Design a protein around this ligand. Structure first.
Ligand SMILES: *[C@@H](C)[C@H]1/C(=C/c2[nH]c(/C=C3N=C(/C=C4\NC(=O)C(CC)=C4C)C(C)=C\3CCC(=O)O)c(CCC(=O)O)c2C)NC(=O)[C@@H]1C
Ligand SMILES: *[C@@H](C)[C@H]1/C(=C/c2[nH]c(/C=C3N=C(/C=C4\NC(=O)C(CC)=C4C)C(C)=C\3CCC(=O)O)c(CCC(=O)O)c2C)NC(=O)[C@@H]1C
Ligand SMILES: *[C@@H](C)[C@H]1/C(=C/c2[nH]c(/C=C3N=C(/C=C4\NC(=O)C(CC)=C4C)C(C)=C\3CCC(=O)O)c(CCC(=O)O)c2C)NC(=O)[C@@H]1C
Ligand SMILES: *[C@H](C)[C@H]1/C(=C/c2[nH]c(/C=C3N=C(/C=C4\NC(=O)C(CC)=C4C)C(C)=C\3CCC(=O)O)c(CCC(=O)O)c2C)NC(=O)[C@@H]1C
Ligand SMILES: *[C@H](C)[C@H]1/C(=C/c2[nH]c(/C=C3N=C(/C=C4\NC(=O)C(CC)=C4C)C(C)=C\3CCC(=O)O)c(CCC(=O)O)c2C)NC(=O)[C@@H]1C
Ligand SMILES: *[C@H](C)[C@H]1/C(=C/c2[nH]c(/C=C3N=C(/C=C4\NC(=O)C(CC)=C4C)C(C)=C\3CCC(=O)O)c(CCC(=O)O)c2C)NC(=O)[C@@H]1C
Ligand SMILES: *[C@H](C)[C@H]1/C(=C/c2[nH]c(/C=C3N=C(/C=C4\NC(=O)C(CC)=C4C)C(C)=C\3CCC(=O)O)c(CCC(=O)O)c2C)NC(=O)[C@@H]1C
Ligand SMILES: *[C@H](C)[C@H]1/C(=C/c2[nH]c(/C=C3N=C(/C=C4\NC(=O)C(CC)=C4C)C(C)=C\3CCC(=O)O)c(CCC(=O)O)c2C)NC(=O)[C@@H]1C
Lengths: 67, 161, 160, 54, 161, 160, 161, 54, 160, 161, 160, 161
């Protein structure tokens, strides 16, 4: 469904958490296409930086046949 | 309440014309029903206690409902259930004479579910009682009158459940 | 229950319990040992009272057991003895409670309508509980026979 | 190597107080004496004086 | 309503059996408590005006509700308040004689919440009033009879809360 | 039914039915009479098809009827044939409905939990309904055998 | 929910038997209904918003509801009104395709009366808007499919009112 | 000349759909070939080469 | 394609296709030659379709091409008829696909926001594709015009 | 949720006093019973599925509830019933570990009565299934540990009744 | 190991490995001689107990050694004894670890899907572990057998 | 929510006309009051911990709820009651700055009585805490500025009663 494989670093700007938080601080995850705009916006609201993002799933420039 | 004849009269009157051909053949259907309905009412009013008697004997008697613990237990509750089934049979006979279930959903079903939930009356056991009345009426009045009586009794079942 | 009856009367008159009702509750609460002894006597002799009174009832009224009768078969006779055990249990409950309100609430309101729906001769049910009273008074001590016969008397009067 | 095969019937339902099955044996032990069939035909009876009058 | 011995009778009745040894043991427990219940009922019936007088003086007087515009104002409402606490104490005496709190949620708590909501009655002020009755009666009659009276009075409080 | 699965899909996707999907309920209602023929021939020949299927299962897998087995007994073979007839009922309901929805809604959801509570081999009951498929292809006409055996392929693939 | 085919399948399954002729006749009746419902849903899905906009233009536009004071004035709640009517037309087409009104009282009529009572939504005006949808649909698709949509929209009206 | 006794017991019950009573007779007619008890010692099987070794 | 819709549904429910869905694929690969013939007729006679549909669209709604409008001028009518050719080619793509998902993912996702940024009345484009299906049913065979009007019908529904 | 120890702690907290000798010897009773509860926990956790298997075998197999029309008919409803018995056994083991029925009060019996009334679940057959679980675990884990498991399963039965 | 489990439980709620588990670690490292004695006893008598456990397993369920069964052939029976030896070694690993997590990590996650794919009765595998538990309890000395019984009962409970 | 100025706007929009002279007079009355409202809001926001501190000190300490077993006991519940009174004071400041008592039944009193009834929170103790709040606030910001605080805290009392 033309998913993105992204990786990003999201720090905690307001709380000093005592549990382990690599898994939601620096993480690699698969995000779908229609969710990726909202997800990238949400990272940039939270203050994290998108380290890298590539199109692991699907083919760029496909006019049709993406569902 | 209303029957089928006043139903088509009111349906003509609400749009404000006289009796048209749909009213004509609806009245012809009701008059053709006619004799069968009045004969079924005559035989039900004849053996009125018989259907409720062996209906309770077929469905309710000798079970955990009429054993201690159940809701048919104690004589006051037994007489109340006999009264309820006489109510249901009388009002089903009235709806059978009418040709419409207006007396059913306008004299019986409103408030009945919530008052039975307040009294703890078993809805499924009342449904099986109504099915027993349906079977004994089908055995006593015939086939066509029996099945339209069954339509009115399981309308009571569908409203109550 | 006598406590329930006195509370109901005091609530109807919108007052606290009178000293007469209160020391009647005192007298019952001291003398309940004899009434529970009567209840244990009836519970121990449960089967023989019902059996002997059923035999005596079917001797006195053989047309409830004849063909065309209400209690014809052996299963129908078992239902007759089941009703006898019901009313013996209610008489035991009334003896324990000290008042006829449990008997009224369980097995005497609408009994005429129930036996009308069942076709059962309620005068013969009154005869049945009368013979149960006779057998219990036969195998019970005389003061205890009078104490149980008060509630048996009430059941006979409300059936008949 | 014995094998435990069950039955089409379930476990028997435990008999309780209100069920008259527990009084069936006591009704049999009574065995109540029924009445003889009455041989009256009622055509020969006449309703003008056999009805009592006091 | 239901007292302890009728509760034993109904518990035997729902399972259909007679009264066994444990039923007689509960009956003897109630018969042991009956002396205390009778003497506590006589004391409360003798002094019943003084209890509600002391309770209203302890918990209701010289407050915002009896300052003008409140619900304890306008003497008709004050007399209705004294009547309400008299009703609470009398039915608590009934439940104390009974040994079961069935009269409390049959003849008192039935609709009492929406009665007080429709009349604008302060619920926790009433709850404080019945608690005032609770320690007044506890100081009046003793620790054990006062304990039983406290059980039924805070049953009234929990139903009203 | 095919209409109820398509309409649940459209209801979830917040749209009207796609014209391809209306064309396929159109195709289903034009071709529905052969499905009724399948249903009536299975209803007519229910006992012999289940006879041959049960007999060939008992030939192929003797461990099922071996001592110690879940289906060892005469009783146990009878309730195995009960399950056989239940799945035959489900296949008739499915070929009437035009979809796999009654089979999954009645006899496939939770069936692994049931059969592991009972200790029965799910691969063996899948083999049973596969044998129902092969004897149905033997007994019934070839063109409708495609649809009937295909729904059988669904239930054996979903069950195994 | 359940359609007509699944309804007769469940009515067989409650007794646990196969399908007999009493299922065959109504099942072939639903197949005979068939293509009519298919093409009616097709043309409704064609001009899907168009029945809604003529229905509001004929009934709800230029009246007291769109005038201030009425519960349809302002763009947000008139948006909610046309979203509701899109929901009603979509789910009535759903009930027409299904052949049963189970989707209506399973998906629409559950809690709708009480949430409209909470929001102060005009019940009679919503009913009249559904009547407008019904008459535009009957003028569009014809007589038989029109009265199928009519009986499902009248079921919506009877449940909501 | 009899009164039909009110046999409340569900004796002579009509064997409805879903019972194994409807398949007991067909289980008799099938008469499945129950396999014999195998004579495997399970004590002399050396598990080093009798296990498949492919 | 319809195989793409069926395979998306089957992957969503996480097993192989139900035989309802293989029936979908089977009837599609029987009717694909007819669908290709219909699309070839529309491709061959495409020019009269767009030209007559645009002319009768201008006859029905002259406000669109009135001066100051979006479509006013020979330049703007050329761009509008290019849009007409785009939509007609997309409906032929839907016909050869067997579903409406290429229609959605090329021209129906974001079309409302597209024409709001362009200042184009989507109700006028809906009337335009109504005249498209009218001219196509006029010069196409009736059973062929049924499915052609079904796919134009989806275009009208999603874009109106 | 609270066990016996924290129930003692919370009761003394509401009493506003320290732990008197009643608290101490109740705690000593729990410390005596703890080894028995741990051993019964190990046995029941080992035989969790088989207890439910033999209980449903000796309670409601080949009966009307498993027949079509019964509520254990269909694999969905059957597996839901098996999961219900698994819930009852696991929460009875939890309450047997705790020495208190608060987990059954707040996590099991909360809403279960009206849930089963909405579902049509047969209460008496469910109760005797729990009774079958009681007999199986009493035969399996011993007499005294089986007696505590039985009184907690009977608490579940009384809450469900 | 029990140290690993205590570390995991402390890390889950971010503790510093409280004395309420550190005294258990102390008791484990002091009393490890008894569990090493248990392990060397099981390792020395590993073949006798697995042969007797297979004997009682085939006594209770001779389906698998029947010609239709999964363990039929004397090679699949050898595979049965090999898998039971695997589970015995897992039990020894657990009794030297102190908890259930090595048996969980090696042989209980996905064992249901494994034996579903292999077609074997997992309830009969659980019965084999039950018989291995009983034979090991008979061979071992009372409280040592009760100590190993926790690990065995874990294997049966997660197997069934 | 709503204030005095948007109440003027909504009262204009219900009848559907523009703003007349009386609307302008009400707006200018609000603009005249706004300086006093801003000054009082600044004083209450500056001293808001002291108001709730002195109010709890003069109305809630050394009571039955503060003794163990009561609702004010258990420091978690104590700080939650402090936070509740902080919420009451902050939303009363919002209402005083606004000029309409719509924020109380839109953001405070919505379900608050149901919350306290399910939570076992003493209604009259909360009411007298609000009375202590408004007395301390009226003593702090003066009689004229404290009049509006009295309006909205008594509105909280009337809604919560
Ligand atoms: C001297 C004049 C007499 C007297 C008076 C007295 N009264 C009280 C106590 C109360 N009086 C009231 C009165 C009213 N409530 C109403 O709604 C109205 C009509 C508008 C009236 C008149 C109330 C409510 C009380 C209770 C206390 C309160 O103020 O709320 C007392 C005090 C009794 C005490 O011990 O608290 C007294 C002394 N007493 C006499 O002996 C003179 C005859
Ligand atoms: C022979 C190939 C098979 C066999 C079967 C077998 N079945 C049972 C018992 C039951 N089967 C069911 C199944 C159903 N209930 C339903 O409602 C439906 C349709 C939706 C089905 C298919 C149930 C509930 C039972 C339990 C009792 C009952 O008959 O209702 C047994 C007996 C197990 C026992 O311990 O008694 C057996 C042996 N054996 C096999 O190996 C094949 C799977
Ligand atoms: C000397 C030790 C220190 C000190 C104490 C002090 N505390 C209070 C008042 C209260 N303390 C509590 C405490 C609790 N509530 C709970 O639910 C619990 C947990 C069990 C605790 C510990 C409470 C409720 C009060 C309120 C009044 C009351 O009696 O209940 C005071 C009194 C303050 C006043 O002005 O009334 C004092 C003096 N003060 C110090 O300076 C020392 C550091
Ligand atoms: C301290 C030696 C020097 C340093 C530290 C510093 N750390 C952070 C914040 C983070 N630290 C971590 C590391 C971990 N998170 C875990 O969960 C674990 C294991 C359990 C580790 C080892 C992470 C992920 C962060 C970011 C998220 C967070 O704040 O928790 C910061 C803040 C960076 C920021 O810009 O917010 C700093 C500055 N820097 C120094 O100068 C010290 C010498
Ligand atoms: C025997 C001396 C007489 C008599 C008995 C008879 N009774 C029945 C049947 C029923 N009796 C009852 C009665 C009660 N239900 C209650 O709750 C109570 C109070 C505790 C009583 C007394 C009921 C309910 C029945 C119906 C069957 C049932 O068990 O539920 C019959 C059977 C009639 C039938 O048609 O089946 C008979 C024969 N008949 C006589 O002639 C004697 C006078
Ligand atoms: C005029 C600048 C342009 C335009 C206007 C136009 N409007 C309508 C009809 C309606 N407009 C509304 C919208 C509103 N409802 C409200 O409550 C408010 C303010 C809060 C607005 C703005 C509504 C509901 C209607 C329908 C009539 C009604 O009162 O319900 C029309 C008529 C369309 C018709 O078919 O009747 C028109 C023409 N259109 C233009 O082209 C001008 C650029
Ligand atoms: C329009 C016909 C009339 C009208 C309606 C009206 N509706 C709302 C808002 C809501 N309507 C619903 C109801 C539904 N939820 C569903 O899921 C379905 C179909 C299954 C229905 C019918 C709900 C939940 C809302 C609230 C959420 C929302 O706005 O979408 C309003 C707005 C109420 C408000 O002002 O807050 C109105 C006015 N009223 C009329 O006068 C028209 C005749
Ligand atoms: C089995 C003894 C009898 C019975 C069971 C049955 N249960 C359901 C479904 C549900 N069971 C519950 C119960 C609980 N859920 C919880 O979370 C807890 C406490 C932790 C309990 C006690 C619930 C909520 C449901 C509904 C959710 C669901 O769909 O599973 C069913 C299914 C009803 C249906 O319509 O599918 C059944 C049949 N019924 C019997 O006849 C057995 C005797």
């Amino acid at each position: 469904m033309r998913m993105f494989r992204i990786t990003a670093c999201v720090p905690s700007q307001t709380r000093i958490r005592t549990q382990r938080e690599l898994q939601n601080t620096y993480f690699t995850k698969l995000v779908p296409y229609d969710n990726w705009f909202r997800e990238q916006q949400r990272i940039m609201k939270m203050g994290g930086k998108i380290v890298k993002v590539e199109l692991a799933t699907g083919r760029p420039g496909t006019n049709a046949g993406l569902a | 309440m209303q029957d089928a004849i006043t139903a088509v009269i009111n349906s003509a009157d609400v749009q404000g014309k006289y009796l048209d051909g749909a009213a004509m053949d609806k009245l012809k259907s009701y008059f053709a029903s006619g004799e069968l309905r009045v004969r079924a009412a005559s035989v039900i009013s004849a053996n009125a206690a018989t259907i409720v008697k062996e209906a309770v004997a077929k469905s309710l008697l000798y079970s955990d409902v009429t054993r201690p613990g159940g809701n048919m237990y104690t004589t006051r509750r037994y007489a109340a259930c006999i009264r309820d089934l006489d109510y249901y049979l009388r009002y089903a006979t009235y709806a059978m004479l009418a040709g419409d279930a207006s007396i059913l959903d306008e004299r019986v079903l409103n408030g009945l579910k919530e008052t039975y939930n307040s009294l703890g009356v078993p809805i499924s056991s009342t449904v099986q009682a109504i099915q027993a009345i349906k079977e004994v009426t089908a055995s006593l009045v015939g086939a066509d009158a029996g099945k339209e009586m069954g339509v009115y009794l399981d309308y009571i079942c569908s409203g109550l459940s | 229950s006598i406590v329930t009856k006195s509370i109901v009367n005091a609530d109807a008159e919108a007052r606290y319990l009178s000293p007469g009702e209160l020391d009647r509750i005192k007298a019952f609460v001291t003398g309940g040992a004899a009434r529970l002894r009567i209840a244990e006597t009836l519970t121990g002799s449960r089967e023989t009272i019902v059996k002997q009174a059923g035999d005596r009832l079917f001797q006195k009224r053989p047309d409830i057991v004849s063909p065309g009768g209400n209690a014809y078969g052996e299963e129908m006779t078992a239902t007759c003895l089941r009703d006898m055990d019901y009313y013996l249990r209610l008489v035991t409950y009334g003896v324990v409670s000290g008042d006829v309100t449990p008997i009224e609430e369980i097995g005497l309101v609408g009994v005429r309508e129930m036996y009308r729906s069942l076709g059962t001769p309620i005068e013969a049910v009154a005869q049945s509980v009368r013979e149960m009273k006779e057998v219990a008074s036969g195998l019970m001590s005389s003061d205890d026979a009078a104490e149980a016969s008060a509630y048996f008397d009430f059941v006979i009067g409300k059936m008949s | 190597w014995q094998n435990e095969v069950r039955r089409f019937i379930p476990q028997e339902k435990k008999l309780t107080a209100g069920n008259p099955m527990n009084f069936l044996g006591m009704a049999r032990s009574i065995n109540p004496a029924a009445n003889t069939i009455p041989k009256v035909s009622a055509q020969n009876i006449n309703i003008e004086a056999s009805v009592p009058r006091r």
